[PDB]
Structures are given as C-alpha cells and as structure tokens.
Design a protein around this nucleic acid. Structure first.
Ligand SMILES: N=C(N)c1ccc(Oc2ccc(-c3nc4cc(C(=N)N)ccc4[nH]3)cc2)cc1
Ligand SMILES: N=C(N)c1ccc(Oc2ccc(-c3nc4cc(C(=N)N)ccc4[nH]3)cc2)cc1
Lengths: 255, 255
DNA sequence: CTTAATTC
DNA sequence: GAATTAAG
DNA sequence: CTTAATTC
DNA sequence: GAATTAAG
C-alpha cells in the first residue's frame, strides 16, 4: 500500500509538483546578449489540434502564462510514430546561445554508480515526474522563454511563456540536480546508513537490509512529497534486490 | 667554343651515352614476387602512329630489343597539348610493387644546396641527357620491363624490352644518382677546391673564381664525355654568376 | 587507360 | 560517393 | 521546421 | 557536396 501511505508523494495522487523551498530561478545572460525574436513557422491545423490540449492543460496549471516579450522562439510540430502525441517542443537553441554557461555538475552515470557499495544490496528506484516544472522561474527570467500561440478561432492574443524551468533549456538538468540536492541534504544527514544516488530526476536509494530499505523509502517519499516533488507510482521499483537504474540492471552487486 | 672543345661530352655531338664503367644493373625482386602479365589496352592508330618513330629510334639504338617474357606492363597513349608528342609512357606500377625496396639516397634539393658555400660564387650547371638510358640493365633483369608492340601492317612479333635503366621504374633515379657518384668520385678527389652538387641528372659545379670555374668545367665535361654521359649543350649554363638550378635562382650567394 | 588520393 | 587530380 | 554533424 | 542523422 505504498500508494495509500504516501498520497502526496506520488504524481498520480498528489497533484502537480512545486518545489516550495526553492527560490524562483533567475537566469543570467551572457554580457553581450540582446533579445532575439524568431518568427513562428506556420503550423498546420493538425499539429495545432494535437498541441492544443497540452497548452490548455499547462495554462490551467499556471505553468504557462500570457505575455508580451522581445524574445521569441519557435514551437515544433513534433511527434513520434506517425501523427500522434503532439507534445509541444520548443527550439530554445538561440536562447541557449545567449544564456551564460554554468559548470556541469551532474556526474556521468558510470561515476555516479561507482558510489554504490556491495554492502547495500536492497534498492528502491524512483523517477520524479515533470521534475523541471517543479522549479519556479523568477518573473524577470520568464520573458526569455516566450513563444507564439494562435487559435484561428479567436483564442489567445499572442505570446505565452513558462513560469517554471522549461524543457529544451541547456541548464535545466544541472539546475534541477543542484536544487533537490539542496532539498535532500537534510535527508542524507538524517539517514547516514543509506546510500542515495541522484541523476537529475532519477533516484536510487540503497540499503543493507530489506527493513532499512522499507523504512528509508517511507522517509524519502514522505520528504519528497513535503518538499513538493512527485514520483511516478507506476514506474516505482520498491525494495527490490534487482532494479533497472540509468540503463543498468543492478543485480547481485553487479554493474 | 665549349661546344667544339668537347665534342664527346655534348648530347648534340657525342651520340647516345653509355656508362662504360658501370656494370649492367641487376634488379632484385621481393622474396615472394612472381611475374605479372598485364594485357595491353588496344591502342588507336593515331597513338600508335605517334609512338612508332620513338620505338624505331630506340630499337635502332639498341635501347629496346625484341623478347619473350612472362612479364608485361601497359604502354600509354600519352601526350600533353592536344594530340602531339606521343612519347611512349609505360605503366610500371605492378612491376615496381614486386621489386625490392632500396634506401632513398638522393638528398632533397633543400639539403643539397645547403652544401653551397658563399665562398664559391661562380657556377656551371649541366643536366645530363637521357641519363637513365646510359646505365645498362643486366640481361637477367631485362625481361622484367617487357611490353607489347604490334604493327598491324606486319611489324614486330610481340614484346620488346629495355636493355637500359627505364623511365617509370621506382629505383631509376636513386640507382642513377649512386652510379655517377661512383663515376665522379675521382673527379672530386682531383679537384678539392671545387664544389660539385649532384641531383640525379642535374649538376652544379661551383668555384671561387671565373678561371677555376672555367678550368673545372673543362675537366668535368672531359670526364663526363669519357665516362659515357652526355650533357645538353642547349641548356648548359657555363661560368655564370647567376644560374637556375633545381627551381632556384642562385644569385649573390642567395637561395 | 588504370589507380591511388584529394575534394566537394 | 560522384568529380577532379595526379601519375605510371 | 531549422541547424550542426556525420556519411558516403 | 548531396543524403542521412540527431536534436531543440
Ligand atoms: N565534386 C566536385 N564537383 C569536385 C571534386 C574535387 C575537386 O578538387 C580536387 C581533386 C583532387 C586533388 C588531388 N588529387 C591528387 C592525387 C595524387 C596521387 N595519388 N597521385 C597526389 C595529389 C592530389 N591532389 C586536388 C583538388 C573540385 C570539385
Ligand atoms: N549519401 C548517402 N547516400 C548517405 C549519407 C549518410 C549516411 O549515414 C549517416 C548520416 C548521419 C549520422 C549522424 N549525424 C549526427 C548528427 C548529430 C548532431 N549534431 N545533432 C550527432 C550524431 C550524428 N550521427 C550517422 C550516419 C548513409 C548514406
């Protein structure tokens, strides 16, 4: 009943996340950067109809808000199979080129796993849902990610932008990893005998016994829920001696 | 009257050369080499008519002789401007690949000229005509360079081959340089105060005074003539303080 | 005429 | 990978 | 739809 | 240099 014991921690039962302890992020631009406004390539009705539901959902969630900005980047008619799942994909390359670089602090999977001791063979893997959207963007940095949205049948005035850390932004993974690391520092301190590996939104908790893993997982879920993050209950691998993490299969202390 | 004083040394007055002091060359094959017989691509009448005179001249000079050989390489319809000067060009690449490698002892022009002292500013440049043809090929190595020659109007049976070091053979330049160096060793010994640079068939004699250059050039021409080599009287640059050698212009001690 | 390398 | 060179 | 890289 | 990839 992991699902029922922690209603707030699961994305399926706790509503959209919001890292309440994290201050809205301010995105520094390179010293010579000036806003760039790239025109939106005309989108076909089919692509527009596919994307529409997502845009409305995000507007309802307050993740997207109307705005007028000197910045503008293109939205793409992206999918995968044939012409389904039209999730909106923003081409933020011209924005990324004007944003100041930050040190890449997210360790590569290989080195991250090196920190997994043979002594801890009871694992719990969790992946946070819509992780980036949990981090607020400071109002001053919001205009930077604006894009155009039109509804030929009288819909929206013009531009919309993100109030949360967006997908496609070059520093989103790193900024999210650093945050969360900050939010989970106390948990690590409260559970010295537990191993916690973090790779952006993918978490691995390792314990020496099934009990400790159970007690540790309870604590982690409780903490994540309270902080405003949400884990996928569907994909959760709880207290297993064999789990799939970052492309590896952890078994018998191997990999 | 350099031309009249040394009839035997100039190609224009001494007949074809023949290095009488040099033993016929034997060309060692790689340890696993076996003869290769490449078919002659059909040659058009125009190409055949252009090449014909050269082949006959060489046969008359004994430089080319009939033969039957398990080796055979192609003759090419080579020219330059449009369809003139049809000098025979043999593709000896499959023969070169089967001949044992030798150390490249011919110095590059740059290093060779480094041996030209500022003290010697009176130059004489000579280039030997048909240098390679002056070196005899041992009968045992002759079959290696065979090619096909036909005269639709009943001319030659089949193959012809060289009795002299041929053009297109990978070791001809080096073998010629080494020979000649051997033939001119005494001259260097008899003229210690003279500088003699050799680059295959291109010679540069350098002296400190116009007189020494005159006396030295006389001696060199006499020696070359007696040994069986022939210098181009037309291109000869005699006792000049400015001469063109190996692409460089030697002047005021420069280059 | 082939063939090995260099460009685009 | 189809032109373009360079060279025997 | 772009755009930067990789192949052939 | 024209395809083919990969990715925002
Ligand atoms: N596809 C196209 N339109 C074009 C393709 C190629 C182009 O240029 C060039 C093609 C070939 C060379 C070039 N080729 C060689 C071959 C050499 C050898 N191995 N003998 C030795 C040196 C050398 N230089 C130099 C430049 C220009 C245009
Ligand atoms: N001319 C032709 N018929 C062909 C041309 C190209 C062919 O293959 C390939 C083409 C392109 C790739 C390839 N392209 C990329 C682009 C990358 C990027 N910068 N996002 C990152 C990694 C990557 N791999 C790999 C193989 C096959 C056939």
């Amino acid at each position: 009943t992991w699902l029922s014991d922690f209603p707030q921690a699961w994305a399926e039962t706790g509503g959209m996340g919001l890292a309440v302890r994290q201050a809205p992020l301010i995105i520094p631009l390179k010293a010579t950067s000036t806003p760039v406004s790239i025109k939106q390539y005309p989108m076909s009705q089919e692509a527009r109809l596919g994307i529409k539901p997502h845009i409305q959902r995000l507007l309802d969630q307050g993740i997207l808000v109307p705005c007028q900005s000197p910045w503008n980047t293109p939205l793409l008619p992206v999918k995968k199979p044939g012409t389904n799942d039209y999730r909106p994909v923003q081409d933020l390359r011209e924005v990324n080129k004007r944003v100041e670089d930050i040190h890449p602090t997210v360790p590569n999977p290989y080195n991250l796993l090196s920190g997994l001791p043979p002594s801890h063979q009871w694992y719990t893997v969790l992946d946070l849902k819509d992780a980036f959207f949990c981090l607020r963007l400071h109002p001053t940095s919001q205009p930077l990610f604006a894009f155009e949205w039109r509804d030929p049948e009288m819909g929206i005035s013009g531009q919309l932008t993100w109030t949360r850390l967006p997908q496609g932004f070059k520093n989103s993974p790193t900024l999210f990893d650093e945050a969360l690391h900050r939010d989970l520092a106390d948990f690590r301190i409260q559970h010295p005998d537990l191993i916690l590996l973090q790779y952006v939104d993918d978490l691995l908790l390792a314990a020496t016994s099934e009990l400790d893993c159970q007690q540790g997982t309870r604590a982690l879920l409780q903490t994540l829920g309270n902080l405003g993050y949400r884990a996928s209950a569907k994909k959760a691998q709880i207290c297993q001696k064999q789990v799939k993490y970052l492309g590896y299969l952890l078994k018998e202390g191997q990999r």
